[PDB]
Design an enzyme around this catalytic site. Structure first.
Site, PDB file in Angstrom:
ATOM      1  N   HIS A  20      -1.670  13.664 -14.223  1.00 10.54           N
ATOM      2  CA  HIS A  20      -1.947  15.935 -14.476  1.00 10.54           C
ATOM      3  C   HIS A  20      -2.868  15.745 -14.881  1.00 10.54           C
ATOM      4  O   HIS A  20      -3.436  16.365 -14.297  1.00 10.54           O
ATOM      5  CB  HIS A  20      -0.616  15.803 -15.682  1.00 10.54           C
ATOM      6  CG  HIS A  20       0.608  14.927 -15.726  1.00 10.54           C
ATOM      7  ND1 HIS A  20       0.670  14.155 -16.944  1.00 10.54           N
ATOM      8  CD2 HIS A  20       1.047  15.139 -14.909  1.00 10.54           C
ATOM      9  CE1 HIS A  20       1.992  14.206 -16.811  1.00 10.54           C
ATOM     10  NE2 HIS A  20       2.346  14.278 -15.288  1.00 10.54           N
ATOM     11  N   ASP A 118       2.199  22.196 -16.703  1.00  8.77           N
ATOM     12  CA  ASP A 118       2.220  20.785 -16.060  1.00  8.77           C
ATOM     13  C   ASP A 118       3.831  21.081 -16.139  1.00  8.77           C
ATOM     14  O   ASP A 118       4.427  21.795 -17.127  1.00  8.77           O
ATOM     15  CB  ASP A 118       1.768  20.235 -16.016  1.00  8.77           C
ATOM     16  CG  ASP A 118       1.859  19.226 -17.289  1.00  8.77           C
ATOM     17  OD1 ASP A 118       2.614  19.210 -17.985  1.00  8.77           O
ATOM     18  OD2 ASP A 118       0.926  18.286 -17.399  1.00  8.77           O
ATOM     19  N   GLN A 353     -11.347   5.998  -7.240  1.00  8.15           N
ATOM     20  CA  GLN A 353     -10.452   5.948  -5.798  1.00  8.15           C
ATOM     21  C   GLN A 353     -10.926   6.740  -5.385  1.00  8.15           C
ATOM     22  O   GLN A 353     -10.670   7.261  -3.831  1.00  8.15           O
ATOM     23  CB  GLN A 353      -9.139   6.278  -6.358  1.00  8.15           C
ATOM     24  CG  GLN A 353      -8.022   6.597  -5.568  1.00  8.15           C
ATOM     25  CD  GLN A 353      -6.824   6.083  -5.712  1.00  8.15           C
ATOM     26  OE1 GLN A 353      -6.285   5.741  -6.733  1.00  8.15           O
ATOM     27  NE2 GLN A 353      -5.819   6.892  -5.569  1.00  8.15           N
ATOM     28  N   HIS A 368       1.097   3.680  -4.992  1.00  7.99           N
ATOM     29  CA  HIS A 368       2.567   3.227  -5.317  1.00  7.99           C
ATOM     30  C   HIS A 368       3.238   4.840  -4.984  1.00  7.99           C
ATOM     31  O   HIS A 368       4.175   5.320  -4.794  1.00  7.99           O
ATOM     32  CB  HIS A 368       2.606   2.992  -6.743  1.00  7.99           C
ATOM     33  CG  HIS A 368       1.925   4.230  -7.584  1.00  7.99           C
ATOM     34  ND1 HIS A 368       0.960   5.471  -7.071  1.00  7.99           N
ATOM     35  CD2 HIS A 368       2.493   5.102  -9.388  1.00  7.99           C
ATOM     36  CE1 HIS A 368       0.748   5.977  -7.885  1.00  7.99           C
ATOM     37  NE2 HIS A 368       1.155   5.538  -9.054  1.00  7.99           N
ATOM     38  N   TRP A 371       2.283  11.416  -6.327  1.00 12.14           N
ATOM     39  CA  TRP A 371       1.839  12.257  -5.338  1.00 12.14           C
ATOM     40  C   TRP A 371       0.183  12.970  -5.346  1.00 12.14           C
ATOM     41  O   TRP A 371      -0.241  12.797  -4.246  1.00 12.14           O
ATOM     42  CB  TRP A 371       2.428  13.253  -5.639  1.00 12.14           C
ATOM     43  CG  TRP A 371       2.240  14.561  -4.231  1.00 12.14           C
ATOM     44  CD1 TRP A 371       1.702  15.698  -4.830  1.00 12.14           C
ATOM     45  CD2 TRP A 371       2.934  13.839  -3.411  1.00 12.14           C
ATOM     46  NE1 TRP A 371       1.671  16.885  -3.155  1.00 12.14           N
ATOM     47  CE2 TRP A 371       2.696  15.938  -2.582  1.00 12.14           C
ATOM     48  CE3 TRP A 371       3.719  13.421  -2.603  1.00 12.14           C
ATOM     49  CZ2 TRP A 371       2.662  16.179  -1.485  1.00 12.14           C
ATOM     50  CZ3 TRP A 371       3.582  13.605  -1.538  1.00 12.14           C
ATOM     51  CH2 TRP A 371       2.926  14.751  -0.395  1.00 12.14           C
ATOM     52  N   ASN A 372      -0.616  12.741  -5.924  1.00 14.98           N
ATOM     53  CA  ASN A 372      -1.715  12.546  -6.276  1.00 14.98           C
ATOM     54  C   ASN A 372      -2.622  11.813  -5.255  1.00 14.98           C
ATOM     55  O   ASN A 372      -3.760  11.808  -4.065  1.00 14.98           O
ATOM     56  CB  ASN A 372      -2.937  12.132  -7.367  1.00 14.98           C
ATOM     57  CG  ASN A 372      -2.027  13.111  -8.598  1.00 14.98           C
ATOM     58  OD1 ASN A 372      -2.745  14.985  -8.637  1.00 14.98           O
ATOM     59  ND2 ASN A 372      -1.302  12.901  -9.224  1.00 14.98           N
ATOM     60  N   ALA A 391       8.381   7.067 -11.550  1.00 16.09           N
ATOM     61  CA  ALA A 391       8.700   8.673 -10.819  1.00 16.09           C
ATOM     62  C   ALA A 391       9.316   8.788  -9.548  1.00 16.09           C
ATOM     63  O   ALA A 391      10.388   8.117  -9.183  1.00 16.09           O
ATOM     64  CB  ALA A 391       7.245   9.219 -11.380  1.00 16.09           C
TER      65      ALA A 391
HETATM   66  O1  LIG Z   1      -7.848   2.890  -9.858  1.00 17.92           O
HETATM   67  C1  LIG Z   1      -7.494   4.765 -10.213  1.00 17.92           C
HETATM   68  C2  LIG Z   1      -5.822   4.155 -10.258  1.00 17.92           C
HETATM   69  C3  LIG Z   1      -6.042   5.926 -10.410  1.00 17.92           C
HETATM   70  N1  LIG Z   1      -6.628   6.774 -10.230  1.00 17.92           N
HETATM   71  C4  LIG Z   1      -6.677   8.073 -10.056  1.00 17.92           C
HETATM   72  O2  LIG Z   1      -5.515   8.446 -11.028  1.00 17.92           O
HETATM   73  C5  LIG Z   1      -4.376   8.992 -10.236  1.00 17.92           C
HETATM   74  C6  LIG Z   1      -3.101   8.964 -10.360  1.00 17.92           C
HETATM   75  O3  LIG Z   1      -2.014   9.397 -10.223  1.00 17.92           O
HETATM   76  P1  LIG Z   1      -0.483   9.492  -9.150  1.00 17.92           P
HETATM   77  O4  LIG Z   1      -0.120  11.367  -9.016  1.00 17.92           O
HETATM   78  O5  LIG Z   1      -1.005   9.051  -7.569  1.00 17.92           O
HETATM   79  O6  LIG Z   1       0.489   8.598  -9.938  1.00 17.92           O
HETATM   80  P2  LIG Z   1       0.290   8.303 -11.435  1.00 17.92           P
HETATM   81  O7  LIG Z   1      -0.690   7.077 -11.448  1.00 17.92           O
HETATM   82  O8  LIG Z   1      -0.227   9.445 -12.308  1.00 17.92           O
HETATM   83  O9  LIG Z   1       1.668   7.801 -11.829  1.00 17.92           O
HETATM   84  C7  LIG Z   1      -5.265   9.832  -8.912  1.00 17.92           C
HETATM   85  O10 LIG Z   1      -5.737  11.105  -8.394  1.00 17.92           O
HETATM   86  C8  LIG Z   1      -5.824   8.303  -8.148  1.00 17.92           C
HETATM   87  O11 LIG Z   1      -6.716   8.391  -7.419  1.00 17.92           O
HETATM   88  C9  LIG Z   1      -8.508   6.166  -9.542  1.00 17.92           C
HETATM   89  O12 LIG Z   1      -9.585   6.792  -9.797  1.00 17.92           O
HETATM   90  N2  LIG Z   1      -8.813   5.347 -10.516  1.00 17.92           N
END
Ligand SMILES: O=c1ccn([C@@H]2O[C@H](COP(=O)(O)OP(=O)(O)O)[C@@H](O)[C@H]2O)c(=O)[nH]1
Length: 477
Positions: A20, A118, A353, A368, A371-372, A391
């Protein structure tokens, strides 16, 4: 200059979770760079982390007219301790911040011109109403999810018994039907503590003055058309719809001194598999063992973000934390780090990432499918190994695999069966080294091109964001 015109002020509110915060930071920067808006992003988090502090510190220096405010309530041990899913606790923590948000709004000589929240933060709506503030939801998910969410209250009436027991795919009007095993987590059991909150989310979204959506015309033409034109859906979700995606980190600026990135720059083009199950994803010790052996057996290069394996108290995901600095490494096979030091780098908890997926030496992403993360794979043209966990990730994984053609996936959902080291090795080889992997990288590249066009000057999402920003400007009017 007291005699200068003041820009209208837009407030945003993000609930706990990197998924988020990160898109809300990106949207906030995109808004503020238009140079017509004062922007304040209020952040609610589950705990302090080094990763969040660095994100915040960077953003709070981005622009003079962009401000970050930490609204994380100070007594969270009670709310975090609630015997409830992470999904439900995100609502509870965000609710504990609404009074502080209202306090901030009240102290202002002039109320904000708009409030963007959100999907976990719509308890701020009464606050907006009291101050005459137009309220928007930035739906950080895709159109297929918005269609499902629009129609789930109807599904609740029309279907008896559990969604996961249904014989065929669930029809969503005008849209691709949804396989029962792919339903959004709260729909997996109608007795779950998130199912009723989800129905409430469905209803409250209809009360928004506008909905920003993290998708674009070229990505989901059918679902967007159904949302806009299908009477079963546009009768319910009446607010105006603004696709503005991909809202994602699409500029990564150079990093000095990062060991991971320096090592990655020494690897061959398209050779490294990045492996990271979001910020919230966790796997069993047994699954972690199979994944470690799969990666070793593949003989492909990799960067692997690991966390503590699932424990007895864990649910479907885990609130993100980075205080277990070395503990996750203890759950690798004995000697793994030294045995794989030539080709493999293991990072506990968090990796860079955005920079990794943008790097030319990255060849694939075991994701996984949050969506981000999905969007970050798309904006960088990286093909995916789809490993959905919680999710709406199973829906995303199906979108990437069946509709976009950019992903490989195991035979059985990982949440239904441990993926063996043999299947993992095969998937990793397919994506990184094989001719099929080159084809899916080219497909990803094709998808990437239309995604970047959407947010470049003159793109559909760029223009839609301008349109939204003019509504905030007129709200000031
Ligand atoms: O080791 C990591 C794991 C996640 N992220 C970032 O955290 C966010 C994870 O958001 P996502 O919607 O994929 O899934 P969530 O983990 O919130 O369920 C993304 O923007 C990732 O690039 C990151 O920078 N490093």
């Amino acid at each position: 200059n007291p005699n200068s015109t003041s820009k209208p002020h837009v407030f945003l509110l993000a609930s706990p979770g990197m998924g988020h915060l990160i898109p809300f930071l990106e949207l906030s920067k995109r808004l503020v760079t238009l140079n017509t808006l004062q922007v304040t992003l209020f952040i609610v988090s589950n705990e302090a982390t080094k990763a969040r502090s660095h994100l915040m510190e960077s953003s709070n220096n981005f622009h003079p007219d962009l401000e970050l405010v930490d609204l994380t309530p100070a007594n969270l041990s009670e709310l975090l301790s609630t015997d409830a899913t992470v999904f439900k606790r995100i609502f509870l923590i965000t609710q504990a911040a609404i009074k502080d948000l209202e306090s901030r709004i009240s102290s202002m000589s002039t109320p904000p011109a708009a409030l963007i929240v959100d999907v976990f933060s719509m308890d701020a709506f009464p606050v907006a109403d009291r101050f005459g503030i137009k309220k928007y939801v930035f739906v950080t998910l895709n159109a297929w999810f918005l269609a499902l969410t629009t129609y789930v209250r109807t599904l609740d009436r029309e279907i008896e018994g559990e969604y996961v027991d249904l014989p065929e795919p669930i029809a969503i009007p005008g849209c691709k039907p949804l396989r029962p095993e792919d339903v959004f987590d709260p729909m997996l059991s109608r007795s779950s503590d998130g199912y009723r909150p989800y129905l409430g989310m469905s209803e409250r979204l209809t009360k928004a003055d506008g909905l920003l959506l993290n998708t674009w015309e070229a990505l989901e033409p059918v679902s967007l058309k159904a949302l806009r034109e299908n009477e079963k859906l546009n009768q319910i979700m009446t607010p105006p719809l603004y696709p503005v995606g991909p809202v994602a980190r699409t500029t990564v600026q150079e990093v000095v001194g990062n060991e991971c990135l320096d090592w990655l720059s020494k690897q061959p083009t398209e050779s490294v598999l990045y492996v990271a199950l979001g910020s919230g994803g966790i796997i069993s010790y047994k699954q972690m063992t199979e994944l470690a052996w799969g990666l070793e057996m593949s003989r492909q290069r990799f960067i692997w973000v690991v966390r503590l394996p699932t424990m007895e108290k864990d649910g479907a995901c885990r609130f993100f934390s980075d205080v277990n600095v070395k503990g996750p490494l203890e759950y690798l096979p004995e000697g793994f780090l030294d045995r794989n030091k030539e080709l493999g780098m293991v990072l506990p908890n968090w990796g860079p990432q955005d920079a990794i997926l943008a790097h030319p030496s990255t060849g694939g992403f075991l994701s996984h499918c949050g969506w981000n993360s999905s969007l970050e794979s798309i904006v960088n043209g990286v093909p995916v190994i789809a490993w959905p966990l919680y999710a709406e990730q199973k829906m995303n994984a199906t979108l990437l695999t069946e509709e976009l053609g950019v992903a490989v996936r195991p035979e059985v959902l990982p949440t239904k069966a441990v993926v063996s080291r043999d299947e993992i090795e095969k998937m990793v080889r397919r994506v990184i080294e094989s001719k099929e992997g080159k084809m899916k990288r080219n497909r990803a590249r094709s998808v990437q091109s239309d995604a970047l066009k959407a947010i470049e000057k003159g793109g559909s999402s760029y223009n839609t964001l301008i349109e939204v920003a003019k509504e905030f400007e007129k709200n000031h009017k």
